[PDB]
Amino acid sequence: FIHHIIGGLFSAGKAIHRLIRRRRR
Numbered sequence: 005f006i007h008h009i010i011g012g013l014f015s016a017g018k019a020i021h022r023l024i025r026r027r028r029r
Contacts, residue, residue: 010017
């Protein structure tokens with residue numbers, strides 16, 4: 005959890021963070 009381990013998954017994490025937003029129950 006430093007700063008280079010984000011652009012490694014954070015890229016798709018955002019996409020998955022959009023699946024939830026699209027899931028605004």
